[PDB]
Amino acid sequence: RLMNNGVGKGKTREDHKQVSDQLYSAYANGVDIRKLVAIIGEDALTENDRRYLQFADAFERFFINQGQQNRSIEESLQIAWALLSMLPQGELKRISKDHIGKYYG
């Protein structure tokens, strides 16, 4: 219920709320499509549909599965950016664009 207090300027990086909101919305749609593939065939899809499939499996394998290591907030946010770089900027509905300009490469 908090984390709206504990993000932002002078607490974490500026983009922390927008990265969290974007990753949640993207992984919700990813698990929607992975529910959809269980019913309809693999060809009823567009191309950023498959990009959400790839982002779902890439999220579940690289963002969560850390095993033991001592990630930072810095390494965590740049892993979140290198995951979001696997998606089109037109699919980035949430993040205000100057974070995208400083990052996403």
Partner 1 sequence: PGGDMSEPVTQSTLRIVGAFWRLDASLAFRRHFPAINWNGSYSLFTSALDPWYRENVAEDYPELRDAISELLQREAGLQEIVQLVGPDALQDAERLVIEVGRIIREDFLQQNAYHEVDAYCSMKKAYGIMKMILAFYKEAEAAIKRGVSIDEILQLPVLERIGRARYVSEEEFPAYFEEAMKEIQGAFKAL
Partner 2 sequence: QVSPTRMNLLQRRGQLRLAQKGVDLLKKKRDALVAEFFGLVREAMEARKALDQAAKEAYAALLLAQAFDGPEVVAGAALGVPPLEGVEAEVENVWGSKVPRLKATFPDGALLSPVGTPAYTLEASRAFRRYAEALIRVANTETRLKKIGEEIKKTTRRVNALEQVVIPGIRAQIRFIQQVLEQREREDTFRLKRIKGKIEAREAEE
Partner in contact with 32, chosen from partner 2, partner 1, none, beta carbon below 5 to 8 Å by kind: partner 2
Closest CA to 80 of 13, 9, 1, 34: 13
**Contact flag: residue 90 with partner 1 (CB under 8 A):** no
Pick the binder of partner 1 from 10, 41, 67, 105 (CB under 8 A).
41
Of the residues 35, 46, 61, 68, which one makes contact with partner 1 according to CB under 8 A: 35
Please give the residue ranges that form the binding site for partner 2 (CB under 8 A): 32-33, 35-36, 38-41, 44-45
Q: Does 33 bind partner 1 (CB under 8 A)?
A: no
63 vs 32: CA distance, rounded Å: 19
CB 30 within 8 A of CB 61: no
Q: CB–CB of 6/73 below 8 Å?
A: no
| Cβ-based nearer residue to partner 2, 28 or 73 | 28
CA dist 29 and 33 (Å) reads 6
Total residue length of the chain: 105
Say which amino acid occupies 69. Answer: Q
Q: Which of 2, 5, 42, 70 binds partner 1 (CB under 8 A)?
A: 42
Note the residues at the interface with partner 1 (CB under 8 A): 35, 37-42
